[PDB]
Amino acid sequence: GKEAVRANIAAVKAVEEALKSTYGPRGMDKMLVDSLGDITITNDGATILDKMDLQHPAAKLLVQIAKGQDEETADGTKTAVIFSGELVKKAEDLLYKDVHPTIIISGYKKAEEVALQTIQELAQTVSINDTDLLRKIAMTSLSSKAVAGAREYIADIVVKAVTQVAELRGDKWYVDLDNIQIVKKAGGSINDTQLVYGIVVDKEVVHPGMPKRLENAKIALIDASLEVEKPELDAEIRINDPTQMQKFLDEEENLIKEKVDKILATGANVIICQKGIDEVAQSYLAKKGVLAVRRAKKSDLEKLARATGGRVVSNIDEISEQDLGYASLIEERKVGEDKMVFVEGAKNPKSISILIRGGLERLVDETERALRDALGTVADVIKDGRAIAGGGAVEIEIAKKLRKYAPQVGGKEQLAVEAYANALESLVSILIENAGFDPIDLLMKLRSTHENENNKWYGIDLYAGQPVDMWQKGVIEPALVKMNAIKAATEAATLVLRIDDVVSA
Amino acid sequence: GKEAVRANIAAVKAVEEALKSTYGPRGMDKMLVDSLGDITITNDGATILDKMDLQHPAAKLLVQIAKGQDEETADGTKTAVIFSGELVKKAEDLLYKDVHPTIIISGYKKAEEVALQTIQELAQTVSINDTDLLRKIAMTSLSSKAVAGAREYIADIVVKAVTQVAELRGDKWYVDLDNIQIVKKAGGSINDTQLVYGIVVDKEVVHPGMPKRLENAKIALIDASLEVEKPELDAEIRINDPTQMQKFLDEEENLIKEKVDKILATGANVIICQKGIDEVAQSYLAKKGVLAVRRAKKSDLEKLARATGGRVVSNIDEISEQDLGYASLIEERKVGEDKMVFVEGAKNPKSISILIRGGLERLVDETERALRDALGTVADVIKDGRAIAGGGAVEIEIAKKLRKYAPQVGGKEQLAVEAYANALESLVSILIENAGFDPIDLLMKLRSTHENENNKWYGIDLYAGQPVDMWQKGVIEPALVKMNAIKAATEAATLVLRIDDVVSA
Amino acid sequence: GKEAVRANIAAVKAVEEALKSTYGPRGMDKMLVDSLGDITITNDGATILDKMDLQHPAAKLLVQIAKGQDEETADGTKTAVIFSGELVKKAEDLLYKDVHPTIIISGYKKAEEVALQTIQELAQTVSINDTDLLRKIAMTSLSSKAVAGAREYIADIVVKAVTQVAELRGDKWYVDLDNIQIVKKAGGSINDTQLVYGIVVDKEVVHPGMPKRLENAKIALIDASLEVEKPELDAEIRINDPTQMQKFLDEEENLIKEKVDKILATGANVIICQKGIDEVAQSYLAKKGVLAVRRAKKSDLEKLARATGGRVVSNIDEISEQDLGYASLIEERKVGEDKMVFVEGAKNPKSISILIRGGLERLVDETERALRDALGTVADVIKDGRAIAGGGAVEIEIAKKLRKYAPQVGGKEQLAVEAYANALESLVSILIENAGFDPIDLLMKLRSTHENENNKWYGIDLYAGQPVDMWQKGVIEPALVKMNAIKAATEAATLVLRIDDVVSA
Amino acid sequence: GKEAVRANIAAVKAVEEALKSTYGPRGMDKMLVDSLGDITITNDGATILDKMDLQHPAAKLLVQIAKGQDEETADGTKTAVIFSGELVKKAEDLLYKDVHPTIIISGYKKAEEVALQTIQELAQTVSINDTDLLRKIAMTSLSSKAVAGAREYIADIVVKAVTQVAELRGDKWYVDLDNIQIVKKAGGSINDTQLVYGIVVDKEVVHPGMPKRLENAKIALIDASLEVEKPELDAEIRINDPTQMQKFLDEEENLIKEKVDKILATGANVIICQKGIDEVAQSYLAKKGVLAVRRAKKSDLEKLARATGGRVVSNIDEISEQDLGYASLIEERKVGEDKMVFVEGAKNPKSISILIRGGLERLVDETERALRDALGTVADVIKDGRAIAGGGAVEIEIAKKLRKYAPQVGGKEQLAVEAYANALESLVSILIENAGFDPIDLLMKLRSTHENENNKWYGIDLYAGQPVDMWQKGVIEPALVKMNAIKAATEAATLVLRIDDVVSA
């Protein structure tokens, strides 16, 4: 009865009360002090709940359905949790009135139903040529990060980078995310970033006597070791005579000059590897006119493979010119505080790279997260095709539309739908609250300014503090992500109402 | 005497109080937390009593008779505990009035007799022809389970699947359950479930370079290693020459292509095993152009035997033409995200399969338990041939009818029969209650709208809140089940009433 | 709410439990031990409730409604309380079932309606000439009293005593009980009692020298004194010379012999007064040959006035031939140890007296009690003219008939009506209980053996301990008394449920 | 602020909670126990507040304004207080929502307005010629009282009695209630209740021999004594000689028959008094063939005076034939155990009387109160001329209609006005509640049966529990009593919210 069900509800509400103040672009920071005293400050919804001490069975089940939802989305999963916790909360006033949860649930289902389709029958059609629109959507992802400065710059890259790679295959839009390389260097400004129309290898050219621009790249992706090490297949017995030592490693140095030559037997003129290159072999490749890089990360090997038509070879004695990576021009460029290798004019037209620059070593590190999500968010819009106005706009519609409906649902069920609806307006009240404005004033100013049918896209610009068309302010977002967010929230929410008791062994 | 006997009573009620909110199709869920964090949310009677840390002798005695009823059932076991505990309540009220428990046993017994025969001379003949009737009884099985998704979809599959398999033994219908295979693949949607007219071998093909459909299959169900490992009869020795390790494994691999050709020496042209298949032996079988499977589960080799006429031979030196299986075409196909081997057109016409899909890894599981139960349930219906209207219709009647007996049975024993009956009405009251309507109101408003003969299948609609015909609304149930619950429940009930004392050492 | 309603229930239930064991002809006696140490045994409902301090509001209210009913009855005020408290009791079980007090009241209303009318449409016509029936109804009062001496004698007497005074008034039968005197003399045999056809003056004759049987009485009822007193109106100072004293008592002795002579001057041959007679004024009356009585009580003067036609005269100068009484023959007669004046053949044939004998000063008293209540009861039958079989026949009928009614009356209200019927069978349970038999056994043995119109008057002989025709064992009762109980009872019962909560000062 | 405002709310809500369960025709009774144990069980609003202490300043402020409303009533004072505690209740949740108290007042003012005019522009025009209708509004009054004997009977009487006295003056209607006398006797059938067309003097006629019916009553309202008095100014000091005693009371007796004749000297054939009338003066008036009444109450001297044209005179030496009251016939008429004088065919056709009968000494009082309040209510219906449907219809309407307004009114104040509408719907819930049905269910089912203007008078039959047209079931009530009920309530409610702190001396 009231006993255990209050615990479950409680726990959930408690977790919502942990994120509330971090909602939206006016959402503030939480600080996290590790058990070793290490400090981590953030507003990432996810992170605050993964790093959190969470032990109640009901809560752990809630976060599993909210967090692990259909699409990826920092602000939607944060929405899902908060909105879960409001759905659980608004139901408590109904239980006080002695309504059975079986009804409140069927009631939340009929509201959900309408809630889902109300975003579908309202969404606008977004495809490959709507590229000044995907720009807006981008800022809708980067504005909620804590990342500073020129996000318009990044919004613009992120867009070009997805539409380069997007492909329509059998009447379905696709994005192979892997055709986008991301390299990051600390220092410089976030305006000093760039889109590269080709591959960017993070590791530099080993020996400074080597060329730094080789014409007509025939790349040799070498997993093998091209650096000596102490005797291995040379003896099964221990070595103790310094005469035997000399004749082993001496022949072994002409063995690496042979292995490198066995690669130049194929026509290779650039050579990048996953293990060492001997310093004498650096002097050899320098005397040959070869551009070599030592110990590059397999993360960049795969991306360079399918850009230039190469593949990674491990058996030096099988390397062939079919393995080589053909590309128009390979170079090693310095861009600001650091340098790296560029592969412009590569075989694949889709394969591109991004160059991140923008403050200190950890500040730049979160700029790649922001870039990832930005890319994702534009691409999912292209992969689906539907995009709605943020700033609370679809919420106040789904709220209004449910309220006018509620009467036709029936008797007790009605209070369920009104409760669901009050919770939807509450969600946007939380975003408005965190801006520092009065919630209800603006909520009402919205429920008035949406009386016509051409005000569907109106919400509250937290910057202005007054009802505005969010579409016509560049704040648009992926329709389906914030549609599966509601689906997640309701699932979890009704699941906590479904539990009659908590038995523990 | 009253001493220990109160405990026994208490303990019985206690058990009842653990299921009380979970009866019928509108019952609520229980959460159960183990000592290492493991959470189980369910509303099945077994699970809620198996995971209970049970102490009392009456309690253990009770659950054994209740649960361990002959019939495979889960709502009948929830009915068996609840009705048992109601009879104990209604018998206690006589002990309070200073009635001897011996009258009350003979009372319950005489009422129990009538109550059973009153389902026999009243149950309707359901058959293989009434395939639209087994469809109903399937929804009446699936409405108790977790999955609310698409029950007409699952119900129809369930019926066709059993009715295909059903046969006439001693002039009465039999269903052998072995003629149905069930394979399940997590993800996708519940409408993507299907019935296959053949066997479906869960395991995928070993190598993509072998056929994807082999014509006119002559299977060799081979339970023998076609995988090299080490030398064991050719090598007792640790082996001091590595040339000899080599020359052992050289003759041993020419030995596996010999073993393969010894299997095609019979005219086999597909080969499935419960053992490994070598990388030289794959290339060999790919070059022979035959269709092979590596380490398939023994559970499906068997379903595929008595389908195709095949046999599992565990010795490559013992495979014969007599043991190979015929089937019209065996292939591999991919249903959504997963791929399996299928064996449509086997020699047996009975042998069919089901492919289950619809949600992630635990939701899919419970979709298989519900479908299995549904298959099982429908099959019990063809094997008996009797079916009554569900939702309380026979209960309220058999109550009324026991009141009409009562006067004539005698003095004190009359109040016992009246008890037996009143408890039975409490059952249907708990069911009304859980829907969230008034138990007394609807119980009385129905047992009046059931006075006429043609209202014998009237019950109480637990979604609209008003008496209707349960049969012509699909709520029918297997007429022997609601006879093994009654027989179980009154056994357990009458076993407490016989016990006078407890001597514990 | 349930809050105060439990107090009120408690309090009524306590009082019920103060009479339970004293109910019916075979009940036991309660002892009441006074504050001054005096002892009192009785079986009187009223006395056990009067000598008991009822401090709870409910109790004080109950008794008023119970006691103060339309016709005076010895065990009907006991029925009224018990039956009240059984309704109050049986109504808590309905609150338990969640039934609202507005419904339980109408239930009890509707139940009373039928129950009242059931006594009508089952009672048999009793008249002034059904005197062997009225012989039973008299016994139906006396048989339950402390005194067991020859009651069939008293039962007979009572018929003759009422039928002499009953007459028709306002087109209906009536009994003016004032035309019956009850005179008693302690000691001797109660079977030596009688009905007298005239009036009985409790005082014997004053002088033995007076005659003791006069033909044709001419009584002079003198409220005046004929006996000397001290001088108080003669002078306005205190007389001190003995000459004035002498002349006071001299002149006064001729004054009292004058006053007597002024009354016998009218032809009055008997003289009864309400004050004293002098011893010299007796010797004058002795010589006159008249029969005179000293200081007769105003109680018997009223009763002799309107029997003989005389007037009670306060003034020696106001007696006249129109103010004297007339009676056929007056006498003094010794009927036992004692002797008293009789006035048989009195001017009014309806003025009669009854003469009590029957052991000790306190045993004569409880015989007078029995004889008064016996008169009451035969008269209330004549006054009504309906009469039913007692011993529980009519309780079980009113029950049966109400159980068939209940189904069509309503939902919950059915249960109230069925409760009111159980409360009536409960009466008869108390009635068994006290006999030394099993209440339910005997009740069921009666409810079976009473299911025909031939057996409508079967009830239970408490002495025999078996169903028998109660009518055919002398147990018939005034059907208006055993009706007024139900009415009393139902008023008080419904009144305890009407109260939600209590306001204190 | 919130500090202190809570005590006053708490105290108010506590008073609401004292009357709640006694609201409507289905309300229960409270029992009231005074200091020396005297008991009073009632449902009367006022009494449950009079015997309440009301030690709170808030409570005393609330009841004075709640009770003391413009029109008299026991239902609308009960509405005034419950609806007050409710207005404050429904405001509490806004103060929590951070709406300011200045806002909730303004909010409420605007709502009160609308709420009032919705009762005006909705009543139907009722007159002395809708005599079938006032039979209903009277029943709607007697249906809520304690007396449940034959109320159609009382209702029909109450109508005739007011429409008899009612008169058209200054284009409006008035009822001179004083022209209706209220006489009450204990016992009898309630059907012998009557209207008398003239006055009833509660006193009977002074001497048995006087005329029982007198023709052409020339009534003489004499407040001077007709009995002889003890000397007090006839001598200076105390009388001590018996000759003076004698000759004083003897000449005073020849004076008193003189005073009676000095009055019959006027033509007076009937003579009514307020002090004595001597036993020799009664013999004078009896031989004169005059009809006299002794010691009639100052109340009845006044009422017969202007019913006849007479005047009450306190000195016999001042009496004249224009002080006589002139009427057709005075007589003495029996009323069960009592007898008393009637004066039918008066000069005034309005001066009439009511004779209450039916129950005993305390039941009759509540009948007198009930019949006064009933008479009043009809008179109030005629003076105004408006009537609405009872049983919850007009509440739910005024609610709905306000809700529709609320959006257009403004931001925060909308919540106040919405609050004010919910507070009106709660009334019908309490009403239902106290009936024993389910509150929410019947209110939704009611607002569904009353979503149209053609269903303007649909409510909830509180006997059945189901939507019906109340008007067409006799449930109509005075349009103004429930309009001023609101106005009282809201006065008190906003005054409580207006108090910011409570300081003390």
Side-chain angles (χ1 to χ4, degrees), chain A residues 390-441:
Chain A
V394 188
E395 297 97 291
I396 58 183
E397 181 67 352
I398 301 164
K400 167 159 65 74
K401 199 166 182 191
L402 271 42
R403 299 183 190 257
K404 298 178 160 192
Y405 180 34
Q408 286 79 235
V409 190
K412 298 168 192 74
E413 295 169 74
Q414 191 172 154
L415 296 90
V417 173
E418 166 166 63
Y420 193 101
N422 282 316
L424 290 162
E425 289 182 26
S426 217
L427 201 45
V428 189
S429 301
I430 292 155
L431 179 86
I432 304 148
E433 199 190 333
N434 275 2
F437 302 114
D438 180 68
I440 289 156
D441 180 58

Side-chain angles (χ1 to χ4, degrees), chain D residues 423-499:
Chain D
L424 294 168
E425 285 188 4
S426 192
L427 300 180
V428 190
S429 311
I430 292 163
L431 192 69
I432 300 169
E433 182 159 67
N434 293 343
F437 317 112
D438 296 294
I440 197 56
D441 297 298
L442 274 171
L443 182 96
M444 290 294 191
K445 282 173 161 44
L446 203 205
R447 287 164 37 163
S448 185
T449 322
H450 200 158
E451 169 71 56
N452 293 271
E453 69 173 296
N454 316 106
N455 298 128
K456 63 184 190 178
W457 293 154
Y458 263 87
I460 299 300
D461 187 293
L462 303 171
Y463 300 102
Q466 79 203 23
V468 296
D469 188 284
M470 304 313 303
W471 191 281
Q472 300 176 102
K473 194 67 172 296
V475 184
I476 299 100
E477 62 182 326
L480 179 62
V481 176
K482 202 163 149 176
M483 176 150 67
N484 283 351
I486 321 296
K487 187 177 74 177
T490 320
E491 186 75 85
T494 50
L495 188 57
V496 179
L497 295 175
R498 180 79 68 167
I499 294 157

Side-chain angles (χ1 to χ4, degrees), chain A residues 329-342:
Chain A
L329 189 279
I330 186 157
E331 199 179 7
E332 180 198 65
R333 297 202 283 249
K334 187 165 176 286
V335 194
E337 293 83 13
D338 261 287
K339 61 181 187 320
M340 59 215 94
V341 161
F342 275 73

Side-chain angles (χ1 to χ4, degrees), chain C residues 8 57-58 60-61 100-103 105 412 495 497-505, chain D residues 21 26 28-35 37 39 41 48 51-53 433-436:
Chain C
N8 292 354
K60 304 183 78 50
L61 190 68
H100 187 267
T102 50
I103 299 317
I105 286 152
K412 305 182 188 187
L495 194 54
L497 318 187
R498 185 74 71 171
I499 308 174
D500 180 44
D501 191 48
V502 48
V503 181
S504 192
Chain D
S21 53
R26 290 309 203 171
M28 309 309 287
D29 289 46
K30 296 299 178 164
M31 171 163 74
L32 291 94
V33 180
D34 283 288
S35 288
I39 306 171
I41 296 90
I48 296 167
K51 287 198 188 286
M52 193 169 180
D53 287 76
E433 182 159 67
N434 293 343

Side-chain angles (χ1 to χ4, degrees), chain B residues 342-354:
Chain B
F342 297 82
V343 201
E344 299 172 321
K347 288 263 308 185
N348 203 321
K350 296 174 174 167
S351 299
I352 64 79
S353 312
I354 316 303

Side-chain angles (χ1 to χ4, degrees), chain A residues 47-291:
Chain A
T47 298
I48 292 151
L49 292 183
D50 272 92
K51 195 51 162 77
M52 190 172 142
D53 290 280
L54 192 51
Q55 53 81 245
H56 198 70
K60 288 171 69 187
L61 293 168
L62 184 89
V63 302
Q64 180 169 91
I65 309 306
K67 198 169 67 184
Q69 78 185 238
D70 298 57
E71 299 302 310
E72 301 86 77
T73 173
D75 290 80
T77 48
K78 180 175 295 174
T79 301
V81 180
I82 305 164
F83 193 56
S84 297
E86 281 292 291
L87 283 185
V88 305
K89 192 175 296 166
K90 259 91 183 144
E92 302 178 293
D93 200 39
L94 306 177
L95 307 166
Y96 195 71
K97 288 187 182 56
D98 318 313
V99 183
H100 284 67
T102 188
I103 321 311
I104 296 162
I105 289 162
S106 307
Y108 279 19
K109 283 165 178 198
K110 293 193 173 77
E112 195 235 63
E113 185 184 272
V114 192
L116 271 64
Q117 72 77 219
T118 294
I119 305 174
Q120 172 51 38
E121 66 151 357
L122 179 55
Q124 293 186 188
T125 329
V126 183
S127 183
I128 200 75
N129 308 108
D130 300 283
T131 194
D132 43 61
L133 185 53
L134 294 170
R135 265 182 181 92
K136 302 176 161 74
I137 298 178
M139 297 281 293
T140 322
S141 81
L142 296 153
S143 301
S144 288
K145 295 298 184 299
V147 199
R151 297 157 290 259
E152 298 81 12
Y153 199 102
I154 300 312
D156 178 89
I157 294 175
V158 159
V159 181
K160 289 186 290 190
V162 171
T163 64
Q164 192 52 56
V165 171
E167 190 160 70
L168 179 62
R169 311 166 182 140
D171 282 313
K172 202 171 292 304
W173 273 118
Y174 283 87
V175 180
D176 338 279
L177 212 12
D178 300 66
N179 299 330
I180 302 167
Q181 150 80 318
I182 292 172
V183 163
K184 52 192 182 179
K185 312 306 196 182
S189 71
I190 205 174
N191 300 72
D192 289 292
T193 57
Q194 87 177 97
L195 166 68
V196 187
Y197 286 104
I199 296 312
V200 177
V201 167
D202 192 41
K203 197 53 196 305
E204 61 194 9
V205 167
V206 65
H207 171 59
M210 302 172 167
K212 304 312 199 62
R213 181 189 289 221
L214 222 302
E215 311 134 48
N216 312 288
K218 290 168 189 184
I219 297 169
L221 292 167
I222 306 303
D223 192 59
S225 197
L226 296 183
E227 177 172 62
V228 305
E229 193 179 85
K230 288 191 173 313
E232 184 174 297
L233 301 175
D234 288 357
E236 299 191 282
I237 74 156
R238 176 178 199 159
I239 312 187
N240 297 114
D241 298 297
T243 52
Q244 191 151 56
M245 292 173 199
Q246 179 209 90
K247 300 271 198 185
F248 271 143
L249 76 84
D250 172 67
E251 202 162 75
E252 191 105 21
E253 192 217 275
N254 288 99
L255 203 73
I256 316 317
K257 290 167 172 173
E258 211 51 54
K259 285 145 186 291
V260 164
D261 234 69
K262 199 167 292 184
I263 288 159
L264 301 174
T266 63
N269 48 26
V270 8
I271 179 171
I272 177 178
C273 59
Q274 221 291 263
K275 292 191 168 63
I277 310 175
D278 209 271
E279 284 62 11
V280 80
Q282 279 153 65
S283 208
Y284 187 85
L285 291 152
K287 283 171 191 171
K288 292 292 179 187
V290 187
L291 169 150

Side-chain angles (χ1 to χ4, degrees), chain A residues 308-379:
Chain A
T308 68
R311 61 183 287 259
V312 187
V313 176
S314 215
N315 194 13
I316 288 316
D317 303 284
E318 180 170 55
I319 184 65
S320 84
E321 72 282 18
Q322 186 55 225
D323 309 291
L324 266 44
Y326 298 103
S328 302
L329 189 279
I330 186 157
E331 199 179 7
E332 180 198 65
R333 297 202 283 249
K334 187 165 176 286
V335 194
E337 293 83 13
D338 261 287
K339 61 181 187 320
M340 59 215 94
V341 161
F342 275 73
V343 196
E344 298 179 300
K347 207 165 282 294
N348 206 336
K350 296 188 171 51
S351 291
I352 48 93
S353 307
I354 307 302
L355 185 43
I356 317 191
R357 296 184 46 190
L360 305 135
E361 62 282 325
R362 179 81 274 268
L363 294 181
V364 71
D365 202 46
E366 303 282 282
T367 315
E368 161 174 57
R369 174 67 45 240
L371 176 71
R372 180 75 182 222
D373 203 3
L375 292 157
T377 301
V378 166

